[PDB]
Design an enzyme around this catalytic site. Structure first.
Site: not given
Ligand SMILES: COC(=O)Nc1ccc2c(c1)NC(=O)CCc1nc(ccc1F)C[C@H](NC(=O)/C=C/c1cc(Cl)ccc1-n1cnnn1)c1nc-2c[nH]1
Length: 238
Positions: A44, A93, A160-163, A186, A188-189
């Protein structure tokens, strides 16, 4: 990371910060060194990434402030996304970045071991989620690499937590029933690193959750043990 603390330099030497250059340079995702020219991350992360030319991998970074125009990085030769991947919430993913140059291993950057096929049975009790992501839903990228110890959750309990979602065995969840500690935007990955028999293993790749560190909402991770053959297929191609 929500409810985490600052890491110490060299604590997670497999952790990387993957930056994007377009339109301006910024942190995009976390990742893990798994081979001398391989980074394991989330599929993603590359939403809208048209070329590997805009990507920069930085290893041996504790603080984002260490990254300037003169900071060395690894260029990306190829982006390999699992071909079954549609979205984080549906699984697969997982992505690999093939680096243009070789990572020199040392005390500041080294690989994390992938889980073993026999370890599908082992119970990990020392798991940590790391990253420079948000400390809450509306926040900003953190300067210092954060860490949080979170317990693993069974597939049955995560379901159970993700209906309304289908939590497969290719996903692995982690979190406290009451919340407070989790990954966030931020992170993720990045890795979910678990210590077993004095060895750290790449158990998960931070993928998704409903909000950040909410009560009865475990973080959802790519279950790396379920992708070892895919990783070897891509990294050991003849
Ligand atoms: C100044 O620099 C910045 O501000 N950098 C910056 C700032 C934010 C993000 C990125 C980069 N990184 C990205 O946007 C990566 C690409 C991408 N990622 C997602 C959705 C769409 C998409 F395009 C998705 C990605 N999601 C995550 O990272 C983590 C998600 C998560 C994981 C678990 Cl285990 C539990 C709860 C979670 N969450 C639930 N809600 N929020 N988190 C993300 N990444 C940014 C925004 N969303």
């Amino acid at each position: 990371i929500v409810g985490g603390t600052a890491s110490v330099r060299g604590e997670w030497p497999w952790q990387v910060t993957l930056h994007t250059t377009s339109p301006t340079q910024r942190h995009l995702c976390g990742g893990s060194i798994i081979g001398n020219q391989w980074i394991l991350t989330a599929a993603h992360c590359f939403y809208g990434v048209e070329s590997p030319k805009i990507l920069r991998v930085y290893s041996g970074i504790l603080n984002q402030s260490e990254i300037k125009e003169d900071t060395s990085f690894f260029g990306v030769q190829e982006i390999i996304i699992h071909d079954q991947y549609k979205m984080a919430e549906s699984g697969y993913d997982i992505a690999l970045l093939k680096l243009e140059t070789t990572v020199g291993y040392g005390d500041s950057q080294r690989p994390i071991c992938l889980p073993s096929k026999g370890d599908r049975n082992v119970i990990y009790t020392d798991c940590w989620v790391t990253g420079w992501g948000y400390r809450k839903l509306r926040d900003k990228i953190q300067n210092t690499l954060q860490k949080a110890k979170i317990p693993l959750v069974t597939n049955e309990e995560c379901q159970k937590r993700y209906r309304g979602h289908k939590i497969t065995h290719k996903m692995i969840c982690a979190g406290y029933r009451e919340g407070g500690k989790d990954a966030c935007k931020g992170d993720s990955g990045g890795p979910l690193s678990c210590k077993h028999n004095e060895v750290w293993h790449l158990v998960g790749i931070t993928s998704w959750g409903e909000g950040c560190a909410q009560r009865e909402r475990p973080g959802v991770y790519t279950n790396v043990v379920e992708y070892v053959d895919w990783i070897l297929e891509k990294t050991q191609a003849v």
